[PDB]
């Protein structure tokens, strides 16, 4: 069984904690071959850490993408597009590929961008994993609160096209335990580990993303492969790490390095 | 105790078999933190497999720099770096940090105004410096390399401009039955020894060797048992590589830990 070819359409973080770093780390971790088309690239400023969103050209873009296609991706996420066009063409190159499997991270003013979503994703998405906050952006919604917001919101989502949603909720919802929702359509099931700590959590949800792509790639169902995501990323996040006094990158490598976390599921 | 902080200075290898891909990789298939500061990107043509490459503006590099110093590497990899004022650059930021060991692959093919700027501004402050045979014969001024003694003049020569260790990659570039790579520290060549293994999907095993011997580095060995990790690294790589198209296939950077460690044999010649 050949390496699965696992492409990520993405910036880059120049902390290296999120974004297609993120991504490429946990393909790597996840035994497939981890591939990029980049997008943007994000810097921070030594002394305030203040971030700087550097666009590349749409040209640049397109070459990538030539041949990211030649070489033929099994899986592609999205993470940081930025932009209607790039969200766009992301759509079409996933239908231009012969991949099976497509995880939208809709990572997010300007409302047009998440319109374009909606418009060109959320219908190709076999997966979309949407956090607390980017859920009620793409319901419409507004601010979700608890599991039954959530649900809602996993409803609107689902009508709007996509197969399988999870809805982060995290450190954003309950403190003592870590919930997502998932939904398939016909069922909601609540995902849960116990909560770590929260000070180093940088670049969880590229993480979990990253995983729930492989975890598909290598032959997992929507629902078996975001359980899977959830423990990997729960163990990166129990082991994250003070980087310096404001950022802390989750460890990318802990769930084979250092343990495995076990999720409880319910359906709800 | 925490990951070691590893960062490369290099291109983006759209195929993702080398270049900052083979890097990321490596560095986190070695239990580092890896990190970048992307120099330029590298596509290629579809039906040509015909490289282009768009580098990446100054500023950004300068801020992507910015950035990774303020986190502090513990080692730093140069990779593809395109032009003097990158090559300049990269050298002062490895002296700028607090980093302890800087691994030089002296990329140039897949302007030799840059083979002088590596000379001058990267040999110098090189832990390590990882040339191929073509690269070897270019910074030594000899031209073309064919033998363990080309390679131990290459070594002395690269060595007196100021590189701490030297090796020589050698490998199918050598053309014999066994993998051959020569190792110098100025006192002692040590040849390096593995099987030859296919030759048809090798793409980003250079980018992959000095990458891990980064890594390893950044890890506590010795300039000398890095190297020699790095080889049965690759080695390991380059054994499972597979076919991408009728133009490439990758090293499986993965291969080490996922399916075997391949002896390297040490002899001092
Ligand atoms: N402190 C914690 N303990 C356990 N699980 C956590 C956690 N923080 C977040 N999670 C979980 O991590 C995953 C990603 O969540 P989410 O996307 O909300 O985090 P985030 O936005 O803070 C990270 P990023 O820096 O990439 O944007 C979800 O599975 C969520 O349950
Ligand atoms: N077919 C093969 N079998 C065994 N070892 C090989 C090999 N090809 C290269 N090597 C070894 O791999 C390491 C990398 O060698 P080198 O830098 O010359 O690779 P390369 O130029 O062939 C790949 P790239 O340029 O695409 O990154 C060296 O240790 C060399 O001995
Ligand atoms: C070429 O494949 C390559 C190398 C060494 O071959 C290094 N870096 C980048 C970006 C490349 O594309
Ligand atoms: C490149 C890139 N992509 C995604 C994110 C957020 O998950 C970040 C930062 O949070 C980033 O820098």
Same mark, same amino acid.
């Given at each position: ?10 910036? /880059?973080? +120049?902390?290296?904690?999120?974004? &297609? ?28 850490? %203040? ?18 296609? %030649? ?45 374009? &979503? ?12 949407p956090?607390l906050?980017e859920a009620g952006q793409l319901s419409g919604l507004g601010?979700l609160? %608890?599991?039954?917001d959530m649900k809602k919101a996993a409803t609107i989502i689902f ?6 949603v999870?809805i ?9 335990? /870590?919930?997502?929702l998932?939904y ?7 995902? +849960? +580990?116990?909560?770590?700590?929260? /000070? ?27 359980? /899977? ?5 729960? %163990? ?6 003070? &980087? ?21 599921? +319910?359906?709800?």
């Amino acid at each position: 069984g050949a390496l699965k070819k696992v492409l990520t359409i993405a910036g /880059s973080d +120049t902390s290296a904690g999120a974004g &297609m770093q993120a991504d490429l780390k946990t393909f790597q971790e996840l035994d497939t071959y981890g591939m990029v088309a980049l997008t943007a690239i994000v810097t921070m400023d030594k002394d305030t850490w %203040s971030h700087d969103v550097t666009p590349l050209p749409m040209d640049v873009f397109e070459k990538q993408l030539e041949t990211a296609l %030649s070489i033929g991706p099994d899986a592609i996420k999205t993470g940081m597009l930025g932009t209607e066009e790039i969200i766009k063409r992301a759509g079409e190159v996933y239908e231009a590929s012969n991949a099976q499997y497509f995880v939208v991270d809709p990572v997010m003013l300007n409302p047009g961008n998440t319109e374009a &979503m909606i418009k060109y994703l959320l219908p190709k998405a076999t997966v979309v994993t949407p956090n607390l906050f980017e859920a009620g952006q793409l319901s419409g919604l507004g601010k979700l609160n %608890s599991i039954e917001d959530m649900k809602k919101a996993a409803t609107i989502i689902f009508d709007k096209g996509a197969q399988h949603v999870i809805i982060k909720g995290g450190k954003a919802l309950d403190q003592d335990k /870590s919930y997502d929702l998932y939904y398939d359509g016909q069922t909601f099931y609540q995902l +849960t +580990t116990d909560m770590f700590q929260q /000070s180093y959590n940088h670049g969880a949800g590229c993480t979990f993303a990253a995983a729930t792509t492989a975890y598909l790639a290598n032959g997992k169902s929507p629902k078996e492969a975001v359980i /899977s995501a959830k423990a990997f990323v729960a %163990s990166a996040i129990k082991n994250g790490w003070k &980087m310096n006094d404001f950022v802390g990158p989750v460890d990318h490598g802990a769930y084979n390095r250092i343990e495995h976390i076990d999720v409880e599921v +319910t359906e709800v």
